[PDB]
Paper text:
CRISPR-Cas systems are prokaryotic adaptive immune systems and phages use anti-CRISPR proteins (Acrs) to counteract these systems. AcrIF24 targets the Cas7f subunits by engaging up to five Cas7f subunits (Cas7.2f-7.6 f), sterically blocks access to the crRNA guide by the complementary target DNA, and induces non-sequence-specific DNA binding to the Csy complex. AcrIF24 forms a homodimer and further induces dimerization of the Csy complex.
To determine how the Csy-AcrIF24 complex recruits dsDNASP, we purified the Csy-AcrIF24-dsDNASP complex by incubating the purified co-expressed Csy-AcrIF24 complex with dsDNASP and solved its structure at a resolution of 3.02 Å. The helical densities near the hook domain of each Cas8f allowed us to model two short segments of dsDNA containing the PAM (G-C/G-C) sequence. The dsDNA duplex is clearly separated at A1(TS)-T1(NTS) position, but no density is observed for the following sequence of the protospacer. For the cylindrical density above the AcrIF24CTD, however, it is difficult for us to determine the orientation of this segment of dsDNA. The density map showed that the cylindrical density corresponding to dsDNA segment is also near the HTH motif of AcrIF24, especially R196 and K197.
Numbering used by the authors:
A (entry chain V): 2 to 76
B (entry chain R), C (entry chain Q): 6 to 338
D (entry chain X): 11 to 434
E (entry chain L): 3 to 223, 239 to 322
The structure:
Amino acid sequence: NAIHIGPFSITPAARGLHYGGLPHHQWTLYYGPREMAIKTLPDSYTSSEVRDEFSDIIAEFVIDARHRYAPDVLE
Amino acid sequence: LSTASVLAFERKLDPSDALMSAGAWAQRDASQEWPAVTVREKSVRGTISNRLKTKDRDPAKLDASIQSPNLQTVDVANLPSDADTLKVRFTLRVLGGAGTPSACNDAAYRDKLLQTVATYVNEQGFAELARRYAHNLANARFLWRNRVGAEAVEVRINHIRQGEVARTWRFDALAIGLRDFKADAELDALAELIASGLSGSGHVLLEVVAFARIGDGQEVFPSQELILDKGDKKGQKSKTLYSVRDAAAIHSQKIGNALRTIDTWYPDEDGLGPIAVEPYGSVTSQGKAYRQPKQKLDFYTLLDNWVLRDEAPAVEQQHYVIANLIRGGVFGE
Amino acid sequence: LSTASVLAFERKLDPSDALMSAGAWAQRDASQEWPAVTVREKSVRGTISNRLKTKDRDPAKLDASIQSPNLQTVDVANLPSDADTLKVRFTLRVLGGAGTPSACNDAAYRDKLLQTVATYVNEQGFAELARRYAHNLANARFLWRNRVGAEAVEVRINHIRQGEVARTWRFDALAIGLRDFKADAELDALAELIASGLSGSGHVLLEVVAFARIGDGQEVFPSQELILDKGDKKGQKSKTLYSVRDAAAIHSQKIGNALRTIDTWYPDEDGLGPIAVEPYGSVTSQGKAYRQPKQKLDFYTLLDNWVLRDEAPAVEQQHYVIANLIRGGVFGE
Amino acid sequence: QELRQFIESFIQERLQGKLDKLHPDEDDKRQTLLATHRREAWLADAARRVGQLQLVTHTLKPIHPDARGSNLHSLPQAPGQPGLAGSHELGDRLVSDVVGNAAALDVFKFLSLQYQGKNLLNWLTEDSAEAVQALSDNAEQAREWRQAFIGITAVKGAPASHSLAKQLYFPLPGSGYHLLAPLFPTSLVHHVHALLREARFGDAAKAAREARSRQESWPHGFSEYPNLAIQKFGGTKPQNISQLNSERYGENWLLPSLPPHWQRQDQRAPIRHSSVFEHDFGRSPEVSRLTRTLQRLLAKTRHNNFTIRRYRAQLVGQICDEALQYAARLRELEPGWSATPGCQLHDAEQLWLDPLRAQTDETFLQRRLRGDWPAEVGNRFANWLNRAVSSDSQILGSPEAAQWSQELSKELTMFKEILEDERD
Amino acid sequence: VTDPEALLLLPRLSIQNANAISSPLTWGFPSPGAFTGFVHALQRRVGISLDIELDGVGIVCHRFEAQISQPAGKRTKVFNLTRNPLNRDGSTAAIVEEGRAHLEVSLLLGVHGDGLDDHPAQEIARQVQEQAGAMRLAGGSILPWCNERFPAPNAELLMLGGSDEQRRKNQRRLTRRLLPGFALVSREALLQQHLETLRTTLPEATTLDALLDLCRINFEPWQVRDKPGWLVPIPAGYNALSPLYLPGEVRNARDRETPLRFVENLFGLGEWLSPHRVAALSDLLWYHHAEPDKGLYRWSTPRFV
DNA sequence: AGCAGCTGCACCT
DNA sequence: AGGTGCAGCTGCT
């Protein structure tokens, strides 16, 4: 059950684990082919919570890409 | 007369949070710059070890549960790899004025209580309770698991009157057992000191330092914290040790519970050893309450028979209720 | 009579964290100032070698994945380029008093359990269990992957009575295999010492040092930690090795799991070799439960048939039950 | 009339919950006997439970679940002394709390549902024909039902406290003492909890949080609360303590009342040459945040130049006190004064920040340090302040930059006086 | 209301297991009413027998250490508890949450009586120290003497004695012993000022004390609206919920010889400041005063600015 | 001749 | 890691 936020995709790791007694899964955030992050989130997390875990990294990507590819300024 | 609606005994025998440190044996006299034992983290991977239900004995389901790894993060505390001696240090103040409650709604009940404990001190001193407390300071009972399997334990108690040391006691805590109560001249002198502190004739201050010879790099056992679970959330760290300013420590109430393990007069047995004193004297390890209210040996009915009904119990039960007075509590309806 | 609700056993055979250092072979008797094996980082470019989903086995997608490889930072530990011998050192204390639980509810259950283990000790000593523990110390099984493909392994075991060595054992750990349990005079003397420690008739503390001749600059394998998240705020660090004071180290539970690999009585086979003693004795490397509860040979059914219904099993399974008692754990509802 | 019909529907909903617990052995016999008795006398059954209810603002059960005492419903008088916040100020924001058994809380939920829709919340008591015609009971039974709601709205408690309550002593001016038994304000924390959970999550709060990441500004207010502590009330069952304890899930949120530096971190004063040379500047985390907040205010115009200059003076006085506190904590933290390998001018300022001479420290060097006070190190601190305050021809050519430099020089003079008071 | 003739300094008081919560809204430093009750019990215990009265407290909080934890998936915090003993049936207990902490605080105490008249200052300071080394401060024990051998003795300092410049120099050399910690004052005037300038939008008072002590992040006209100091919430005192009650008419009182009342906490704003920012060292003394015609039972520190 | 306690059961979200 | 009440209960007299 992958999650797509624009060009980003968050996929689970196809076999979970037990952290602290609770079942978890590793979610990977990709921007196309480039792997951006990995988190270990529990089960009984809705997809909105999985989105809001990676929303900060997505927002920092947007900030850096907006500042890097800013157009030129004439005065 | 009746019981007061409020009753509140401030505790005596206030201990400190016992801090841990480490070093080598036969350097324990110069053990003031010994570095603290710190709390680290590590990872554990376990298996399924608990009892399964009768519905879940299926072997395919057991293998499918095994093939998911079980991982925890665990706080640990060890000795350094070149030190073999754990040093546990705390301070214990004895206040005195063991009879007076901090709160009493009934005035005549508090006067009857005051003359009752006054007559109890007049009948005999605190020397039974004081000798038992000095035993629990002599053998290292406050080393809870750190004492178990140790090679040699040694306790030093410094009575400090002014800013310097008034007197020193030196004990081999493994000769003094945890079962019986002996009599020794140094131990009886310490018993006189803590009895005189309990009698209101002074404010005694003690520094207790215990040296346990465990081994190089072995594990020590400080107190554990109470963390209630974040159930519908991420997994937590499944052990958390107590630390005071990055030094592994035992809780104050843990040392206090180890101190008042004096009660050898509970009706169930006498060879199982002393227990801690509390109303309906109940040990958490056995999970079972000795001194039940259906027999007349718990604290509340004994206090009501001694004060309200003026039926003085036996001298060991007067010792028990006096120990519950020193222990403190919030009693009432 | 039923089993207790809570019932817990503290572990005997407590090891410490094993520390790694490096040096040259035949200087190994002067191996007290050998410098530690340090954990470094290096870059790793990961190729594509997983099984594909076959909804992603299109060649254009595969070549697009191959054109953009991903990179990690990885903790690594090697020997120095001039040293060829890995030295691994830890301490192990044998305690004794194996039958007594540290927590119980029923008094009748713990008394039945205590007389059960008392009858076990009276039928035979700890000689089989301590023989197998001494074998697992003799062969250097606690070198998990460092033993694999070593040229020569030598174990020095020092029984340490006071602060100095009482007795010394020297073993060629490749002659003593990992498969069977032979007989040897020095090995039987070590087994008698471990059995004397397990019987409560002494305080056993050993220092175990292992020298493995691997090669110059070769990779050693310390214990490995747990990584929950990974991002660009780190170095995309995807592997963390355990470390005590800037020293590559092995977890204490890893050494403990390699010590109790004694179970040769599991019903499935015996040509595979011994496994570690677990309730429903399971191997994480094989994903399988030997001693399934459908057969009557797991720990819980054997213990309940031995204690409650007095059905004493075979002496091999009695060894297995007492091994699970020395291993410790939480057994209850 | 019609309100009465609605009440019957509510009773039916209760029956449905019972229905889920279905038993084929004898569940139909209990179900028919329960449903007929409910449809006949739901109000008569509910009034007996509603007698146990109490409508209250202040509860004793959060102090201890074992404790039993009088819980009072009142809104206290407006206090005369200024600078005060309390539960008394927001009277229209108030919500009523319920104390009783959980079966009584079922009837409390039924009464709260009956209050909605029509005017029957105030009209349960003040009505006869419209109440009884909808209730479908006799006029005497309707009067008995109205008396039950009037009693449940009232307190019905004898004045008393418990032994597990606080009951503290306040001293009088030149006289004896008074006992004060403080009660847990429950409506007040429920209102503060509503405001906090509104500030933390809403479409407004989440929209402003996404707008901070997007950095594109619409007119909005965005609130943020750091390190609240969560306190769980009683056991795992929150309904035992109060009714609103079940709605807030038995937890109340506590705002930080902490001192400023409550997480002590060891500072490495020790002997590096570049370590002492860079520690002469000594930029810390909170000092860095204060420096950024001060540097943002610099370009401000003259229309807010008075308040902006007052804020800059307050920031400079806070930074000087933070530097003094950091020097004091660094001096107390290090046990000795360790010699440094190749540390010139880091040792030069560290002699001004020095503790007493140690065993490794020389008596001659210690006497030389004790003889001369380090005011020149304060001049070096002024060089740090010129490093902190950016100046140029926009400030040097204008008149405001000279006044800002004069205020910074006055603050540096006060700091230099405080520093030179120790040495010499 | 009364300017002290002298100040006594309880030098470095270490306290274990002190109460942290102290309020139904705050959890950090304990309430100043605990310190006022401390010196009133100290006056009851050793103050009366020396022809000395004690009036207020100045508190500086050298160090803090709360027994809390953060539960690994949330930004809030939980408290660490204790294992209470079992019930009489041996089942379990009921978990009531209490919040413990560790404190290092110094106390500034004002004196009006025959201070240097009947007894010298050193003996008064020593026996007040000996009395305070046997009680407990805020629900937690005063931790006794450890290997801190230096900070033991006090300094009974006469306020108005000496020249005015010498008065400033001795209060500065006493402030030299109060450097690491940050003193605590009341800020009811700043509260009312922000309440009046906030009331241009809406007339609410508790929402002010909410909005005073958080991190308000205002949008770009990204900034953080900031107060110049360390503004915290404090329990400002007590306001009665009830009329006066006679000593006998309420059951389960602490005593049947003292009148009783039912009260509520009034909450206000305090402020932590550096002790060098105040010139007169008698400005920090927290006095508690009763207005028994109504419920206003207050701790504050008047005569501060 | 009752009394008081007491244990146990049930409620409920 | 619940408070509550109350129904029923024990009882021996």
